[PDB]
Nucleic acid binder design. Sequence first.
DNA 1: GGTTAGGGT
Length: 138
Amino acid sequence: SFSLLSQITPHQRCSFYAQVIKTWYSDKNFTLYVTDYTENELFFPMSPYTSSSRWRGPFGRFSIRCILWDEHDFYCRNYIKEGDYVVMKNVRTKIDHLGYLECILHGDSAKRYNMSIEKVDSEEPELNEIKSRKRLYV
DNA sequence: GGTTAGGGT
């Protein structure tokens, strides 16, 4: 079953719809920052004051970083783009060294977990709440 | 696995 991002808690498998705000690829992994415009007390508070940054929002604790390893990296890195919507299913969350929630997709997860990330066509009606909530923060 | 909310690869 799906959860709003405000409803996810560390160390539990979860599923959610989100919009991709930022991507970053590296030699090690592929990184997404995603939001559904709901607030979570463990997300990192993104600052509007950063001297140099291409982040335009949302600010505060409204987005979660996802680290994609191995097949998840190879699959998404030249596919998922900023502005896309995604559906992430049965993904795990952890707490990093500084105490912030993060979502991780580890390589070769058991088929039984049915863990996945897929792009959602932007015209899909399940994305309506995201688009509506976005209006509160622009 | 990686380090810390940038960079813009």
